[PDB]
Amino acid sequence: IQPRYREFPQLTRSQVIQGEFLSSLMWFWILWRFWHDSDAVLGHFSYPDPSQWTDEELGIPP
Amino acid sequence: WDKDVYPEPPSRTPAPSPQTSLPNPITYLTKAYDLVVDWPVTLVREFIERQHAKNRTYYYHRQYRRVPDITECKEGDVLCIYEAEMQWRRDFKVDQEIMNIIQERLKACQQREGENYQQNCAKELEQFTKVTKAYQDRYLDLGAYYSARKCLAKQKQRMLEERKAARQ
Amino acid sequence: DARFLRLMKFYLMLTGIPVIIGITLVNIFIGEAELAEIPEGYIPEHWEYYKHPISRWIARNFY
Amino acid sequence: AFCAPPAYLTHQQKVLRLYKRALRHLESWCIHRDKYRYFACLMRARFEEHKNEKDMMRATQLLREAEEEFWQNQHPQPYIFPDSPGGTSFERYECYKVPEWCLDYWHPSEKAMYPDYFSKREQWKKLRMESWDREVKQLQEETSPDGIMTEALPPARREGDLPPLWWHIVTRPRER
Amino acid sequence: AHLTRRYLWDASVEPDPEKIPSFPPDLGFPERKERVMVATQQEMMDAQLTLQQRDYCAHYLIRLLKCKRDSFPNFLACKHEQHDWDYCEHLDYVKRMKEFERERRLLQRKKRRA
Amino acid sequence: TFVAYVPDYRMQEWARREAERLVKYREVNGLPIMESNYFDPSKIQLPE
Amino acid sequence: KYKPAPLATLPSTLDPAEYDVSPETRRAQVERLSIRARLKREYLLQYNDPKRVSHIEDPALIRWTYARSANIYPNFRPTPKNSLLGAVAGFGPLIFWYYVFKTDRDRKERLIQEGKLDRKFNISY
Amino acid sequence: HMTKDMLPGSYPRTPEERAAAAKKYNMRVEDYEPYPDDGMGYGDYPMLPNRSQHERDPWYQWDHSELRMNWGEPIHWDLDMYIRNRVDTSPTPVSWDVMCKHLFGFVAFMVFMFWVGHVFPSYQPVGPKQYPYNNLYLERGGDPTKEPEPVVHYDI
Amino acid sequence: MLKIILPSLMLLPLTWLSSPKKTWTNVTSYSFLISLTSLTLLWQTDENYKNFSNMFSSDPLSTPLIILTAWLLPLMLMASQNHLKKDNNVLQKLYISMLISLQILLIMTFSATELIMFYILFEATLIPTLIIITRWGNQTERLNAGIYFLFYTLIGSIPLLIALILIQNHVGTLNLMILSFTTHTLDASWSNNLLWLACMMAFLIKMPLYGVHLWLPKAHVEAPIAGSMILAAILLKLGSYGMIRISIILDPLTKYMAYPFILLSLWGMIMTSSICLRQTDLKSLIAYSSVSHMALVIASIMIQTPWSFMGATMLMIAHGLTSSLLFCLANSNYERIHSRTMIMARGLQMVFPLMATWWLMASLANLALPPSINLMGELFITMSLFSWSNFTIILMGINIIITGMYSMYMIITTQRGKLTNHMINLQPSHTRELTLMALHMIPLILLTTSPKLITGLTM
Amino acid sequence: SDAPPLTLDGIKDRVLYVLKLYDKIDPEKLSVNSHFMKDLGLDSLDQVEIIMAMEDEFGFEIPDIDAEKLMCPQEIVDYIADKKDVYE
Amino acid sequence: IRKMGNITKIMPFTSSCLVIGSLALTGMPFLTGFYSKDLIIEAINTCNTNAWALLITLIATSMTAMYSMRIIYFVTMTKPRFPPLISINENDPDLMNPIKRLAFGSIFAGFVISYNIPPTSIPVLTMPWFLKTTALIISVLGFLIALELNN
Amino acid sequence: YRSSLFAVSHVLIPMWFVHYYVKYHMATKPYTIVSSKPRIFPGDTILETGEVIPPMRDFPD
Amino acid sequence: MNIFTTSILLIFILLLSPILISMSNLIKHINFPLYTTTSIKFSFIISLLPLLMFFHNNMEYMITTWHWVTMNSMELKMSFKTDFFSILFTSVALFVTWSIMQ
């Protein structure tokens, strides 16, 4: 369209609000499935520290 | 389509357990397809088959009488050699097609068994190994100028070796 | 180049399409045939051991 | 790229070209135009320092040290100008830059349309043959038997008549 | 961890993963117990599973696939099943951790014997 | 057209048919599908 | 710093033999220029020559082709290192490949005579 | 049109022949220098600088804009590899020795460290995954008539 | 077979007496009718080979060559219809007559059983070629080229004949399939070895190895389109067919009488494929490519495996057609320019927009782009050679690579650059030459579709 | 997304814009033929930097052969016009 | 890049989509990159993988974020170092709709597939946090380092 | 309108021809199509006769 | 078991159709890019069905459309293997190619 010269152009709202749409949508989805799957990055399961087991179990001769 | 030739094992189909509060798309999709596409196609097929039946035609299968073999065939003479060698080429071609059939049935069995091909797809592999030992001991190292004479020399050398082994 | 394209497409279609159409009409009306086993009173002829009508027609007329 | 160069060069042009090259490589190194201006002014001062000097000794010494410093501190991947060599548009359109003489072999059924333009080609070629032979004597008369010539081309010393060897320049297709 | 403990620190006690039964299986268990499978060859065959897929954790997975097929378009309906399946695999990986630690301690014992 | 409607070029169809029939025959009768010896080793005679 | 090479020649500027101010060398440059200008002018008196119905002949191209194609054997004089390189290229590699293939075939043959090499499925060969 | 006088010949051992050859090839004598005489066929075709064609002045509107070569300008005997769609002697800011050294050093370091890591690998501090039915001795073909080593798996 | 020959023996007086304004069209169309009628041989219902008399015969390995020849005749005609346009009617009639005699001889030989008839025809092929090459060339060395051609061929011819005599005497007859049904085995001494030589040396000298590839480039260069066509297509194939039909007797010699020839063939394939990179002359490049492929043919012929023979026939036919096509394209670009050189004309595809797609469709068939009979043959032959040894895939691959290279080099120094500005003589494409390209191509498509015809003895 | 071509008035206005934003010697009043070295007492450095600024302003590059010889805004404009083939 | 900037303001749409893609390639937790990349980075350290291989792989996982933020800075955050003239236009549908569809895809399809495909293999969900979140941590490291250096 | 015409001329007609091909030239041949065996589960009944099937044993925890 | 192969061949037939049009004379009258874009869109919409049927059955499929040759115990034929990998890759590639064509 009508060019400019060493100045900033008058922009339309459609393109900019579509960009804002996409970005807000990404943030929304991220927060949603973060809420729902906070463990997908941590895990609901506990990894054990050996030296916490007992020779009682897994029988050993001393 | 000789089913005794091509087994086509049974089809233990499962049952539908649509436990939810939402409709199966495939139901309506395949219903509409079988409705709009198969109807005209089926009518046209019936039309074609009716025209066929009204102007029917038959054709038979060529049965090649048998003849003597290379053995009962005096050297130098030819007529016999030719009427034997061509029969032998026919047999060669038939054995090749048998190999093709085995391989086709084998790939079928494999896919139709899926991931269990190592357990249920072992029967056919035995037919294969056996048939293949046969086809090897028969038609392995002849040469593009293969023929009954060379096959016979192969057979005879192999027999002599087996017999020497047996005698010692 | 337009000329070559158009003229080649013509001098092909001209007889390719009539021929293909005859072929379709044949496959529909005549169609292929059956594997009727051999009776013990008939000695089939070279124009009867072949399936396709065109094939057997040629084998009966020419060869 | 139309005019041609001389065989030898001069200290003047050598230094100018070194200057332009170094400034482009600096625009490439230091991206922001502010930093570019800063260091360009610094290079300008470096030059103006020794500018007034004229001794061929110092000239050659400084020039040959400058070229080494330049080649040793240049940008590996410099800033190429698209429409010029190395870029991503050089010759990009040569696949479409057809010449004119392809015209003659048109078919009349095609040049039927576009009639006006072909109404003017003739009066252009007509503007060529009528003034060709003259363009030769202008040189064969001024082909100085001295036999020491450059690649330059003299104009039409007469009026009305056209210059010599304008075909290979005029009619050169657009750039698009 | 055990890596450096093996490479720059003590150089032999750190066990080898590929010879675990090198030690007798009941050196500390009076009449040790064994494991159990809760799904038969026939089932784990007709369900068409794979070999890196069918372990002692197979029944959870079978029920998972049933609940996944059924209500397919309404997916996400099989999550209490995935939780349990991952739980079982966690249990198995823990059993393996424990066997490795067992071998570590038994090597400690052997070396204490000299 | 001629070529495409040529029949059973070098018998690659009759042979398939024949193999199907023979395999049926032998599968039923219990014989093996291919014997490792072609000619009758009885009619044949060898030296020592 | 920098060194020359058969690939990355010493660029134009750095060349010590450039920046020379010899009158004889500059005169040689100007003679090259006279030559090149005469050539380009003779070429432009044909690129635009009207009434032309043909193309231009490149005698440099023709001579290059002649020297690559047919002027070879006449001016060819056999000498050593030449006969040597020729005999090498004509004998050596053939014989190397041949020993390779013969050893492989003999290995295969003795293996089979022993009756070991797994040939299952080698039905078509 | 061509002729023997305009075509090549034998190695000129006399300036008398050399000068005529040069004025034929459209060059200058003091620059003209043929190839050595080892009888490989070079004949008398000039020996020119082993330079590529990416070097030539790219701005001048050459007649052969794809070769940057003028009309009669003699043609390097090995042009076929300097046609500019091929080998490029475009000088480099970095140098031959140093670039080869860098590359070989890097690659040697990489492969050496890969061998190092294969000899001293990583692994998780656990044992091997278990398998119920003799490592599924059936589903791996096995056989229905052989009872191999009974692979019993225990609890801890 | 007379149904194929007699009309080809009538085209001659037809040409002689027909008026100038009509001889071209008449003879062309009728030769096309001959090509058509030449398909009766394809009614090979059953395996019983065709035999018409004690003097003729057909076979699956010969029929393809027969049809290809009867179909390359008219293409030679057409491609030979713009040059010699200012040559007298009588002269162009002579040219036509020579072409037709070539056709007839080639048919009779590819059909005949008795190798002695095969041989006399294999040597009568010369006169028309030598003539066509000397009396219609465009350079001066055509003379030396014809001499080399003739004398290489006859040197080959001689010991072949002597061995045919030794056979005809030791054995009773020379008829094929009798040679088969009554062959035997040889004590494998120096006598039988030199016999193997005197039997294969001529066929090899014709189908060029590395050592004797010299008469091919000279011919294909100095000679015109028709001679180049027929050379690259058939006059090589004659050696291959002879070797196939004759090697049936020399078992087992060909196991250890092959290593030198296989080695030479492979090394020559490689070196010639390399030279195809830096060979200026376009037609010379094409000729050396032909050498590179016929080396594969030979390596596949010797070791005598069925896969190998079928691959040989496939690649044979494919190369024949593709080389005829490439030579048509070269000639085309020559008549407008009159210089074979590759680097003179450049940056086309801006004025011959279509022709390129007749250039492209050739290269892709040279570098073995599938699905093409070319690659099918190359691949089956590589399979046979891998079985015969595991250390030949090396050379197969080097050749494949160098081909993938020089084919595109050729495409790109003639249809990928930027257009010159002094080639004002670029008469646009003629419907005639476009037709020649299309006719050389289309059969490749149909055969890629249904190749069962083009397999060989073993299929 | 191609913008429209360039015309002589636009070219001239732009060149004056730039040579006026210049600060060294230009007295903010440039005649179209305001010769740099002669009619303004400029330096080769300044002229070369002008050429470079113009190169950056119009994207393309001006070769040295003609950069060293340009000594007039009218000449710069004539050059640009004969390079982009403007004013049909 | 050396002759462009301020792309965000002058052209928001392409910049938003480019940031989406850059973060997805970095391995943002739920943008269809994660659902494969992070399981892969689990297995790579969880299995008996060669040391140097693992190590350079993680280094590369960082360099991803590195050059992604390089794009970002040099194109989308610094000043408009491009020429003066401007004829921007992106309101055309044939160029504004495709990117929209592809962004929706790049955001959803990864998750959809990771939850809908049959579970081919058996994962490993038992490890420490400094081995379950390594890709995340190291990509954040890349972000910080790229910021420091670009500044 | 053009939407429906395109749907027709570029989905329907080919679909008819291809259904003909499949259902009367491909499934009419021994092993042209190979329907991999379905994935049964425990409890799942059968649309064929296929009497009910058994579940597994204890599901502790 | 008929809709599946129908779709898997229909996608290829769609992609063919334009190429065929290229041979013809309509291009000078028609918007070939939009034509091809929309044909690709419908190819994608078709390819989707396999995904549903496959996730709902997890039944791989193998097909042998056309028998090319029979080379003496080593045949050849146009065989397809519609399993997870390809049945998904088709859909992804089309979802990308439609946008690329626009």
The gist of it:
Chain D contains six helices and no strands. With 176 residues, chain D is an all-alpha fold. Chain L has one helix and one strand, in the order αβ.
What amount of the residues of chain F lies in strands? under 5%
Inertia-based shape of chain F: elongated
Helix count of chain F equals 1
Q: Determine the structural class of chain F based on helices, strands and strand pairing.
A: mainly alpha
Q: How many DSSP E strands of chain B?
A: 0
Largest sheet data of chain F: none
Specify the helix fraction band of chain B.
Answer: 55-70%
Largest sheet of chain B: none
Based on CA inertia axes, which overall geometry of chain B fits?
Answer: flat
Name the quaternary structure. part of a larger assembly
- Helices of chain B, by number, come to 5
Largest interface (CB within 8 Å) is between: G-H, 43 and 43 residues
Radius of gyration of chain F: 18 Å
Radius of gyration of chain B: 27 Å
Per DSSP E runs of 2 or more residues, the count of β-strands of chain F stands at 0
Query: What structural category do the secondary elements of chain B indicate?
Result: mainly alpha
- H/E element sequence of chain F: H
H and E string of chain B: HHHHH
How far do the termini of chain B sit from each other?
A: 50 Å
Q: Give helix % range of chain F.
A: 25-40%
Protein name (chain H): NADH dehydrogenase [ubiquinone] 1 beta subcomplex subunit 8, mitochondrial
Transmembrane segments (chain H): 103-123
Family (chain H): Belongs to the complex I NDUFB8 subunit family.
Keywords (chain H): Electron transport, Membrane, Mitochondrion, Mitochondrion inner membrane, Respiratory chain, Transit peptide, Transmembrane, Transmembrane helix, Transport
Commentary on this structure:
- The structure is cut from a larger assembly and holds 13 protein chains of 12 kinds.
- With 168 residues, chain B is mostly helical.
- Chain B is 60% helix and 0% strand.
- In chain B, helix 3 packs antiparallel against helix 4.
- The longest helix of chain B is centred in the middle third of the chain and has 35 residues.
- The two termini of chain B are 50 Å apart.
- With 114 residues, chain E is mainly alpha-helical.
- Chain I is 68% helix and 0% strand.
- Chain I contains 19 helices and no strands.
- The relative contact order of chain I is 0.09.
- Chain K is mainly alpha-helical and 151 residues long.
- The interface between E and M is small, with 3 and 3 residues.
- Chain B: Belongs to the complex I NDUFB10 subunit family.
- Chain B: Complex I is composed of 45 different subunits. Interacts with CHCHD4.
- Chain B: It is a peripheral membrane protein.
- Chain B: It is found in: Mitochondrion inner membrane.
- Chain B: Its main location: mitochondrion.
- Chain M: It is found in: Mitochondrion inner membrane.
Provide the fold topology.
The structure is cut from a larger assembly and holds 13 protein chains of twelve kinds.
Chain D: H1 11-29, H2 33-51, H3 56-72, H4 108-111, H5 115-129, H6 133-140
Helix pairs in contact in D: 1-2, 1-3
Chain E: H1 2-7, H2 41-46, H3 58-69, H4 80-112
Chain F: H1 14-29
Subcellular location (chain G): Mitochondrion inner membrane
Family (chain G): Belongs to the complex I NDUFB4 subunit family.
Keywords (chain G): Acetylation, Electron transport, Membrane, Mitochondrion, Mitochondrion inner membrane, Phosphoprotein, Respiratory chain, Transmembrane, Transmembrane helix, Transport
